[PDB]
Design a protein around this ligand. Structure first.
Ligand SMILES: O=C(O)Sc1ccc(O)cc1O
Ligand SMILES: Oc1ccc(S)c(O)c1
Ligand SMILES: [Zn+2]
Length: 257
């Protein structure tokens, strides 16, 4: 099946997922000089005070932190969105080296990693229905650069030891995702897709302008995870990012001038 190596990586995905060559694929490079400032855009509203985290999982292509999404506890509203989007999970993409790892780029600049906070439009009742709709998902993308440590990230990095291989999970309660946000919520937004198979074109991307800083030791622990299951040859979980895709007939909009 699919992954990120030479024989099953992104340049091969289109044979099983033909939408990979679709018209609204992600990620993309954000050219900051051709993005359109849009005064019509509202500030984002992040209400994460009642988030209920459940579990952290190694799924063979990243680690996911999963939330209880049976009620409007942790929601995203405003910005370019219509309606209420519930948080269901977050994950990261990262590199083998600090000079690469993000999926979106900014004027061709790569960051060391990218955080994806995945939300689905409550109007469609569950996540499974939402991914079949052009306005079904809203994904907050946040860049990570290497510098000072991020206190709110350390609880995540401390548990990675326990989910090193594919299929492992651990209880992960009382984690507050507010500690992963930058100070400013200025953003770029464009319509796009999941960046992993099945690559569905159901995502409103909201990419924050301001990165968060993490220390080298924090992202080093990310790179110790494994793509393989226990009892298999070890393949380190690194470079789980898809390269930038042709923007084609879209305009990236900015919430700031
Ligand atoms: O995060 C996931 O992807 S796992 C999950 C599945 C369904 C659900 O309603 C809530 C979840 O957190
Ligand atoms: O549900 C999702 C899985 C992976 C990725 S990159 C998403 O953006 C959503
Ligand atoms: Zn992602």
């Amino acid at each position: 099946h699919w992954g990120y190596g030479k024989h099953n990586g992104p340049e091969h995905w289109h044979k099983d997922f033909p939408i990979a060559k679709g018209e609204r694929q992600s990620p993309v490079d954000i050219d900051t000089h051709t993005a359109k400032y849009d005064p019509s855009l509202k500030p984002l509203s992040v209400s994460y005070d009642q988030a209920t985290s459940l579990r952290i999982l190694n799924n063979g292509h990243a680690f996911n932190v999963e939330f209880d999404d049976s009620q409007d506890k942790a929601v995203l509203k405003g910005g370019p969105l219509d309606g209420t989007y519930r948080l269901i999970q977050f994950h990261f993409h990262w590199g083998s080296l600090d000079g690469q790892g993000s999926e979106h780029t900014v004027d061709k600049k790569k960051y060391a990693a990218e955080l994806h906070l995945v939300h689905w439009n409550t109007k469609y009742g569950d996540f499974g229905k939402a991914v079949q709709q052009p306005d079904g998902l809203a994904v907050l993308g946040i860049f990570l650069k290497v510098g000072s440590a991020k206190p709110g990230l350390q609880k995540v990095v401390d548990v990675l030891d326990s989910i090193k291989t594919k299929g492992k999970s651990a209880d992960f309660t009382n984690f507050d995702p507010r500690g992963l946000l930058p100070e400013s919520l200025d953003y770029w937004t464009y319509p796009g897709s999941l960046t992993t198979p099945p690559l569905l074109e159901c995502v409103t991307w909201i990419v924050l302008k301001e990165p968060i800083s993490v220390s080298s030791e924090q992202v080093l622990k990310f790179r110790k995870l494994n793509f393989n299951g226990e009892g298999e040859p070890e393949e380190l979980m690194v470079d789980n990012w898809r390269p930038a895709q042709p923007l084609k007939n879209r305009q990236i909009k900015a919430s700031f001038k």
